[PDB]
């Protein structure tokens, strides 16, 4: 049994702690490593990983992880472990990142993109060994999403024994280039070009994987990946051309899996601009945003109309959030009501660098421009280079624009706080909107543990946001995993990653 995974580009880094491109994770953390807790398959909730169990103190400040016993690291021709995983390995993995003086902190000229993106420098107070099987993590303030952060790829647990050996041997770089973990697959040290090869770990604590060998074959052309998948020369492909999706849905040889991405494409509105400061005007522009047309024209099937600022996989989703239905007549009337019988002139900043959240900002902008014009809003499309687009948006120069956001941990806090907190102006809160009650709900919700209590708080916060319409959500992208019919037991991951543990091959 050999699964062939055909990927578009060669993975740059085989070390999750120092990876920028989330696609590298599929070649390392996803097969070779484990985390303290792991996301349940297909879900955003966590379950025990290298921690067999954990406790959180009353105040939400202290996380205590009790480590699974008799977990072995892999070996290669350079390294054979003499002890099982313990707290030293966990402390090493966190501290390499958090402690600038740590001996491995600059190994590989490494940059801890995710540690910083998830705000651990400010959230994390300390990571301490209590005993060999107990790790105590203390936060600077309570943060419920932290438990899900711990399950993210960048917090994969490395072997300190291996790291100690390599430092002693004068080649610490090897830690990042020849990965050793506790995970379900072992990185084959003998490697060829245009491919990454793995073998099943017989000693894996969850039980040995069904598939004995994994080949990641670099196959740069989308059309070729598709062709080979039909041919059974690939079992899985990535970055399928959207043009091919419709026919893939008809192909007997293909099992096309799909689900909404944890992202949002929206029209941002600068609520400090004279006309856009007016809530009724914003509601009017919202009524004059043809979301179905946009999704239809722009995503060519690979997207869904957004009703909430996050998809229904996210905690707090509200299936009956009131909508500003597309109605130009109502839009123009609202504009008159707001004191603008002849509308006004404005700008729509077009995003110049395509992202998965929105594969065609230019066409998005054009559709909106045409409808807005019909209600007397004359919006010129404005082009900028990537860096300018971003910097002058953060600084509040824009009026309207085509923007997107992707959540990395999938928690409602990691949509609503970045987008709408006062603290993120100037910053990720492009619209500059704030509301005292809304901000209090976000803080309470981020600092409360109970799931259903959080969900109600988020639903309340989102209703306030919706009433004020500071941005106009229009789409979530759809992620696709095209599989050959032979592969069984693969579960699509909300974050987009591909894990092959638990997967089996027919025929």
Numbering used by the authors: 8 to 514
Quote the study on this structure.
Based on sequence homology analyses, the bacterial SBP superfamily has been classified into 8 clusters, with cluster 5 comprising dipeptide binders (DppA family), oligopeptide binders (OppA family) and nickel specific SBP's (NikA family). Apart from GbpA and/or DppA representatives, some Pasteurellaceae also carry the genetic information for a close, although phylogenetically distinct homolog, which we have termed HbpA2 in the present paper. Interestingly, the HbpA2 clade diverged significantly from both the GbpA and DppA signature sequences. Because we were unable to identify a molecular interaction partner for these paralogous HbpA2 proteins, their in vivo role will have to await further study.
Indeed, our thermofluor analyses showed that none of the two HbpA2 proteins under study were able to interact with any of the tested type 5 SBP superfamily allocrites. The crystal structure of HbpA2Hp was determined to 2.0 Å resolution by maximum-likelihood molecular replacement. The structure reveals the two-lobe α/β-fold architecture and β-strand topology typical for SBP-like proteins, and is essentially identical to that of the structurally characterized GbpA and DppA proteins. Crystallographic refinement and exhaustive examination of residual difference electron density maps failed to provide any evidence for a bound ligand to HbpA2. Moreover, the N- and C-terminal domains were opened by about 33 degrees with respect to the GSSG-bound GbpA and glycylleucine-bound DppA reported previously, again indicating we crystallized apo-HbpA2Hp. Importantly, the crystal structure of HbpA2Hp offers an explanation for its inability to bind peptide-like ligands. Out of the 13 GSSG-contacting residues, 3 were not strictly conserved in HbpA2Hp, i.e. A380P, S430T, and D432R. Our structural analysis offers direct evidence that the A380P, S430T, and D432R substitutions would be grossly incompatible with GSH and GSSG binding as they would abolish electrostatic, H-bonding and hydrophobic interactions contributions critical for binding of such ligands. A similar analysis, this time against E. coli DppA, shows that R415 in HbpA2Hp takes the exact same position as the active site residue D408 in E. coli DppA, a residue that makes a salt-bridge with the amino-terminus of the bound dipeptide ligand. Thus, R415 would prevent dipeptide ligand binding.
